[PDB]
Amino acid sequence: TTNTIMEQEARTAPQKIAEQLLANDAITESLGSVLREFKPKFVMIVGHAGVFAKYLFEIEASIPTFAAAPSVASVYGKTLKLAGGLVIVISQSGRSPDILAQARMAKNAGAFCVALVNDETAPIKDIVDVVIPLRAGEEKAVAATKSYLATLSALLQVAAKWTQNESLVEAVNSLPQALQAAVDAEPQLRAGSLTDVKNLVVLGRGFGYAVSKEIALKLKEVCAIHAEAFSSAEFSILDVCIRDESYGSHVEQIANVKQRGANLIHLHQTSADIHPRIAPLALLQRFYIDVAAVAIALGINP
């Protein structure tokens, strides 16, 4: 243990998210039946949580999902035709002008609008149709940990309640225990693996690609290492390995770049018994604790 606020906060994520899912069960149940009547033609994410949301809603609901480009609303001043679509606004504080502007425009276009927000006093609440509180508490660390996991858990519960896919409902039911298992697992990323690393490539596929971007960002923000995330199909190297449908094509690519001579550090979800849709969060949970230790070792206070 580093005794940092970052690691202390990361270790609280299983408990905060367990409380979140229980407290939000009713409001997401209600949003689910509203969405089944509304029948979104697409999901637009207003804000890396969006990349995760894209794989989540496309795979589990077959609904095209994508991220808004903020400047279209704020700089070019354009409203999009969003009638019949769902807009999810993801904002911790729920106060930024650009976020509020995108939300009003989405509403004025006839979109059904949901906000995922940590601060329930925020003015986003007076614009959107539905507020899902993240219930992560206060994050004192500069690097977000529990608040990002809380966003993914809220997305997962919204999706579980809307689709009512039994395996997704099972995934959400298992999520806090799985995160706690990841907290209790053995460290994966160790400072030794990065001693002379300046440029770094994080590779993942599918949901693992979604969490690779968060990992690359956190290595930049916390460890001062130029990290960039890529899909392993399209592509020294950080392997984000998830045991889901992407396992087969991903490990073949990782195996061959290791064969060709790349320097490899391997992350994984910590246990085979974790539901495939929860595995990306479990891997991240583990990484959040381990990157705190790494930062201290390279001489940085997280």
CB of 42 to a second copy, least distance (A): 6
CB of 198 to a second copy, least distance (A): 9
DSSP label of 111: -
Amino acid at 133: P
Tokens encoding 12: 């609280």
Beta strands 65-67 and 112-117: pairing type? unpaired
Q: Which residues contact 54 (CB under 8 A, 6 or more apart)?
A: 45, 65, 66, 67, 210
Backbone angles phi, psi at 135, to 5 degrees: 60, 35
- Any contact of residue 47 with a second copy (CB under 8 A)? no
Closer CB to a second copy, residue 64 or residue 137?
Answer: 64
Part in contact with a second copy (CB under 8 A); list of ranges 1-9, 12-20, 53-61, 124-132: 53-61
Closer CB to a second copy, residue 27 or residue 67?
Answer: 67
Question: Do residues 283 and 267 make contact, with C-beta atoms less than 8 angstroms apart?
Answer: yes
In degrees, to the nearest 5, what angle opens at C-alpha 62 toward C-alphas 58 and 67? 35
How many residues at the interface with a second copy, by CB under 8 A? 39
Beta strands 86-91 and 43-46: pairing type? parallel
Reduced to 3 states (helix: H, G, I; strand: E, B; else coil), residue 227 is: strand
CB of 13 to a second copy, least distance (A): 26
Reduced to 3 states (helix: H, G, I; strand: E, B; else coil), residue 48 is: coil
User: Which whole-number Å values give the CA distances from 167 to 155, 173, 213, 285, in the listed order?
Assistant: 15, 10, 26, 21
State the distance between the two ends of the chain, measured CA to CA, in whole angstroms. 13
- Per-residue x/- track, 85-104, a second copy (CB under 8 A): x-------------------
Closer CB to a second copy, residue 76 or residue 166?
Answer: 76
- Any contact of residue 231 with a second copy (CB under 8 A)? yes
In degrees, to the nearest 5, what angle opens at C-alpha 160 toward C-alphas 243 and 110? 125
Question: Do residues 18 and 176 make contact, with C-beta atoms less than 8 angstroms apart?
Answer: yes
Part in contact with a second copy (CB under 8 A); list of ranges 1-9, 24-32, 117-125, 204-212: 204-212
Closer CB to a second copy, residue 120 or residue 245?
Answer: 245
CB of 20 to a second copy, least distance (A): 26
CB of 237 to a second copy, least distance (A): 15
Tokens encoding 146: 């529990």
CB of 218 to a second copy, least distance (A): 16
- Any contact of residue 78 with a second copy (CB under 8 A)? yes
- Any contact of residue 75 with a second copy (CB under 8 A)? yes
DSSP label of 276: T
CB of 19 to a second copy, least distance (A): 31
- Any contact of residue 66 with a second copy (CB under 8 A)? yes
Distance between CA 253 and CA 136 in Å, rounded? 37
Candidate list 138, 186, 196, 234; residue touching a second copy; CB under 8 A: 234
Closer CB to a second copy, residue 26 or residue 75?
Answer: 75
- Any contact of residue 71 with a second copy (CB under 8 A)? yes
CB of 18 to a second copy, least distance (A): 28
Residues at the contact surface with a second copy, assessed by CB under 8 A: 41-42, 44, 54-55, 58-59, 62-64, 66-67, 69-72, 75-82, 84-85, 199, 205-206, 209, 226, 228, 231, 233-234, 244-246, 249
